[model samples]
Target chain A: RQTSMTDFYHS
Target chain B: MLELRLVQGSLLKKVLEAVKDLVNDANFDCSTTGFSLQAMDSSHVALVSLLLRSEGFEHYRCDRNLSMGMNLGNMSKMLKCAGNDDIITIKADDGSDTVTFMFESPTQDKIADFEMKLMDIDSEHLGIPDAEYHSIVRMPSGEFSRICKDLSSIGDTVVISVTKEGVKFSTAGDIGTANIVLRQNTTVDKPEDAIVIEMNEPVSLSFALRYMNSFTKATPLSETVTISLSSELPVVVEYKVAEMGYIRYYLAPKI
Candidate 1:
């Protein structure tokens, strides 16, 4: 239920 | 009493401890050396600033020096997934809006990089002068942690006093009187094995909030020793040594 805690991220 | 990590959780843990109470965001001034942050909590009663020298990291690289304003909450949340044995990596490109974090599990060969948007926090820096404290006591971190915890259940504010006698902690006892606990460092035979050591130049006493100090206490696991500096007119300084990884200073002000 969060965006920051995702194990993987794209930026 | 510190050594190389099993290469476990990195600076992520220490960073969270210092900035959690104060500001939701912080301005991290990064250079080739390491990272530094100076931020006053929303209430302005406390100031938390720290320096994580580049030498602390296992592999640190900075292309160019820059300031990255980060969301402390966002960054801290991301670190929740990190295991105690995970290796941490943080990378932010020049002019990038988002900072990246990679947690590598050596045994599992697993790696996860988290990305979070960086916001602009117009934070003002305080000119904290390094003044010579009247009394500085270095003692077992766990002891201080227990002192803070036990006194907290009894009261909110605790008095810290240092004299030729020893360091004394006082709080309002249940019977409407003062409860006192004294801590002393060894006088003779300073053994390298002993972690609780107190050094004082003069008598100094002050009052500080307890739970607020937990920020500094959380880092106790990093080292057995914690240095507490007390001055009549200055904010109390509690420092946690992380050995070769540098040190984590905390909960700067309860003034």
Candidate 2:
């Protein structure tokens, strides 16, 4: 699935 | 802001390409303007090149300025689909790493990879000084073809010495190929003529992978110009409209 999360959450 | 970005993948691609050819633990030069690394081949030859000022994102908001890690491994993981298109680059403040996010429209899919930039002792890289020289500008498509044709014949390409006309030739286990470029060849174009004024022919052998990475910048501009000399370094430059210019320089491989 395509994920569009903020850099903070992804990090 | 410019066109070469379409070919070179936002300057990040050039940096990643150079990193692939380096060995681990070797000192690599990384800075705000450029990054480079050098490795010695058993044949007693040194392979080196640099990605100059314009090949990078101007103001990347990264927590750390320098990081060192296996750049080659990182490149494979980034999951970036397009070489010349934009991808989301992520950097976290507390970590010494960054991530690349690439999406595929055809498949409706996405990929991601992260890399750690390790700290290492910086080394001084040789760069071409800002001096006036004859410049030659040609179509990017034409330059890409020349590089591909020459690379197919051999690993090393020899440039002929003549102030007015320039020649590129390559010979290898497969065969040999050559291309001659002159003023009229670049005359009907939008840019200026490709300049060449050297005392002798300068021969240089570079990796095809690097050339491929360099060609990615071609879409950012209509023409690619080269400034070179037989004894001195040779520069391959691409001008991006409304943005800036990107250039790479390599020292003459021999005397």
Candidate 3:
């Protein structure tokens, strides 16, 4: 199954 | 006054070649600790960090900290004249506007000196905090280069998924979709050929393949590339610079 990960900080 | 002589001159040339494409003008920060540079791409999408320890140089002397700014492309051009076997020596006065690059052939019969005018470039020193990443993968540099290059032809972005089974690289474009998976393989003959993965938990992230491809320019500098990924931090792609230091590239994941 393809799970989701949290978004990474850019700034 | 500042003076540094590097016996392995080709390493300097390769470092310039690898970074010239990403950064046009940057200040090389030199201090008693080491020589380093930190700069983000024009778009600020990716950051390139380089460090060469003082002990790495055959001869190192710096009376004071200095930031010498120059056009990296031009620097690379000057380094091109140096033979691979030549010894490279850099010299500059504390307040000099021009920097000197002296190349000495292994035989010492041929010697050349190129002087380049320094520029005033405003740059900010960004602090990258040390943090524990979710997964760190170390694989052959050539393998990463090939993966980024091949995926770029098919898609603009690559979705990297890491799990206990292995790591997967997936991409989709108008042409088609492709997936490349690498499992834990430690039975390789060479250490660089082995795929090692350390994961606290599974994580998936998407990044621009273009930036990733550019990062692979350092492939020749090291046999293996180390990638550190976290949920809330930019992915760190690092390549060792001989026995001196490292060149690390950081790219924030796309939402």
Clashes of each: 1, 17, 0
TM-score of chain B, candidates 1 onward in order: 0.81, 0.53, 0.98
lDDT scores for all predictions?
Answer: 0.59, 0.38, 0.88
The collision pairs in model 3 are none
Better of 1 and 3 by TM-score: 3
lDDT of 1 at B149: 73
TM for every model, in the order presented, reads: 0.78, 0.52, 0.95
DockQ for each numbered candidate: 0.02, 0.01, 0.10
Stretches of candidate 2 off by over 4 Å are A1-11, B1-59, B62-67, B79-86, B92-124, B134-141, B151-157, B165-181, B185-187, B190-227, B230-247
Which candidate, 1 or 2, would have the higher DockQ against the true structure?
Answer: 1
Order of quality (lDDT): 3, 1, 2
Candidate 1 structure quality by residue, lDDT tens digits, B1-255? 111222557456655755665567888887776667776556454555577667776666776777888888778888878876798777777757887877889886798878889888776766555666656666555556666677767776666766666677776756453545455534624322234435556554444454345455344345454445554343344554365333334333233
Instruction: Report the lDDT tens digits of candidate 2 across residue range A1-11.
Output: 11111210111
- lDDT winner: 3
**DockQ, cand. 3:** 0.10
Model 2 / residue B112 / CA error / Å? 4.5
| By TM-score: ranked, best first | 3, 1, 2
